[PDB]
Symmetry: C3
Subunit: 156 residues, 3 copies
């Protein structure tokens, strides 16, 4: 009954591990962002919110508002989901597409699913995650950063 | 019952203000395009049309056809919507994602919604709009241009 | 009842014609990829699979697994679709957006539709295809490669 679309990108820099779909992945560099740069969750939240017609992470997570300043993506997703259910919506299914030249996400997909299908209730079958390489082409191909696109569905 | 997806990008150049979602926004440069470069509406039209399985703005708005030569995006959207209803379709909901490093769209989102929810009938709640920065990464990050992605849904 | 999203890109190089949507298109260069670089079908398969929650072409088409090593995109799509129906899903509609500076896809859209609406059963009306230029902007604008995005829907 309601469709949503999210999109988000983040740039590299900072040694430490990166976090995607709530999973800590080892890698040369880390992701910037003044919040743990979880492009996957951020794009997922935006999809969900955009389908409920509630904004785009700037309603709960602005940037200069003491409401939700320092918090990880898992908390925001969880908060965003609460407001969405407040408007009487329930999850149908969500599909997430991660775009990066490296590192390899294939081995982490399942753990990501577990996290996501946990912070939204629902069973894993209602959550899909996949990654794509881009073939060393754009800013993602040159390893300058990482991007993610997501879609979602709601009800009754 | 029917899903659609649109995508569109435009390059900068030309002083004058830019137009996005039908709103006149102030900015250093303007958008090229041989039609007011309204990436937002163009991507929205394509979504709607692509869900109705009627093409991609080249059915009503080609480029070398005296049918709809000089016209703004609002007219084309409005025309495209008419043909869509002709095939007996009605709007479910649409979500638009604008991608740009600047200017800030946040303050114009609501006015955009008003315009869109006007040229498609329906109430604002069936139209969502959000913007994202890209973090100074791709051609959008370098300020070379602006892009937009959109999804939609129809019926009965 | 189930939404899906796909995305895929490929780089140029290799004289010979390119293949998109199963159609052989004439052009200066060809597409790399260690499989016929059919970005259109690959993105379409991923959408369908991602909506059925079955992966992302690495379940049927890995890279180092003698299962489905050398095969064109039409075979994989056809195989992927079979497994999808195995889980009791049926096609609702799909929309594909091809992104490239050249060559012109406009004249091939219909033949692509015929191929797609053949390997998925269903009538053409359940399959949409469109192309966009990008305005000589990103890696697609510089002619370095070609990309494709797709969405889909399933049932009962
Ligand atoms: Mn982010
Ligand atoms: Mn345009
Ligand atoms: Mn591919």
């Amino acid at each position: 009954m309601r469709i949503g679309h999210g999109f988000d990108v983040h740039a590299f820099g900072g040694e430490g591990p990166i976090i995607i779909g709530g999973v800590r992945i080892p890698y040369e560099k880390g992701l910037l962002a003044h919040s743990d740069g979880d492009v996957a969750l951020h794009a997922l939240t935006d999809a969900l919110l955009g389908a409920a017609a509630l904004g785009d992470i700037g309603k709960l997570f602005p940037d200069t508002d003491p409401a939700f300043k320092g918090a990880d993506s898992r908390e925001l997703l969880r908060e965003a989901w609460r407001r969405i259910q407040a408007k009487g919506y329930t999850l149908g299914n969500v599909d997430v597409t991660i775009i990066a030249q490296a590192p390899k996400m294939l081995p982490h997909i399942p753990q990501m699913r577990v996290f996501i299908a946990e912070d939204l209730g629902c069973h894993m079958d209602d959550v899909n995650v996949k990654a794509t390489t881009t073939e060393k082409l754009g800013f993602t191909g040159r390893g300058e950063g990482i991007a993610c696109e997501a879609v979602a569905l709601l009800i009754k």
